[PDB]
Amino acid sequence: HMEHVAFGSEDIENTLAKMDDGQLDGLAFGAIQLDGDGNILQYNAAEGDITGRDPKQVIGKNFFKDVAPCTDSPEFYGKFKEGVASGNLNTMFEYTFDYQMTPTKVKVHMKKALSGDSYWVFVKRV
């Protein structure tokens, strides 16, 4: 009932290109797909369990402006938009999520998706 994909795997963008919503919900880690502006295209069940948000409700919201203002910073949004601009986004770092929630530290892996104007944000607890 799970997709046997590890967080941080070198070819994660190839493995996840085949997955619809149900398959994304089979991952062990949170998975968000953003467009280049930060609008949420996809959001899986594991991420909803980490953050408390409803994966169906967040689609179409802007990550940086709307749902995740704590990521509107050089250390998160800044890294994202630099990787969008280069066309080779691939950066991993720890971060704390603290907006209208118990502060929760995560490991974040942002990586360009194979789909046009699409960027993954992968998430697990630390």
Ligand X SMILES: *C(=O)/C=C/c1ccc(O)c(Br)c1
- To ligand X, the closest distance from the beta carbon of 53 in angstroms equals 4
Give the number of residues in contact with ligand X, rule: CB under 6 A.
12
Structure tokens at 123: 């998430």
- To ligand X, the closest distance from the beta carbon of 100 in angstroms equals 8
- Which residue number is nearest to ligand X in terms of Cβ? 70
- To ligand X, the closest distance from the beta carbon of 66 in angstroms equals 9
CA 23 – CA 103 distance, rounded (Å):
28
Contacts (CB under 6 A) with ligand X, residues 35-94? 47, 51, 53, 58, 67-71
Alpha helices per DSSP H over the chain:
12-16, 21-24, 45-51, 79-86
For ligand X, the closer of residues 5 and 58 by Cβ is 58
Q: Which of 38, 76, 19, 30 is nearest to 55 (CA)?
A: 30
For ligand X, the closer of residues 6 and 65 by Cβ is 65
Which residues pair with residue 42 across a beta bridge? Answer: 33
- To ligand X, the closest distance from the beta carbon of 86 in angstroms equals 23
Structure tokens at 69: 């203002």
Q: Is residue 24 a contact point for ligand X (CB under 6 A)?
A: no
For residue 41, give every residue at least 6 positions away whose Cβ sits within 8 Å of its Cβ, in sequence order, or none. Answer: 33, 34, 35, 59, 118
Residues that bind ligand X (CB under 6 A): 32, 47, 51, 53, 58, 67-71, 97, 99
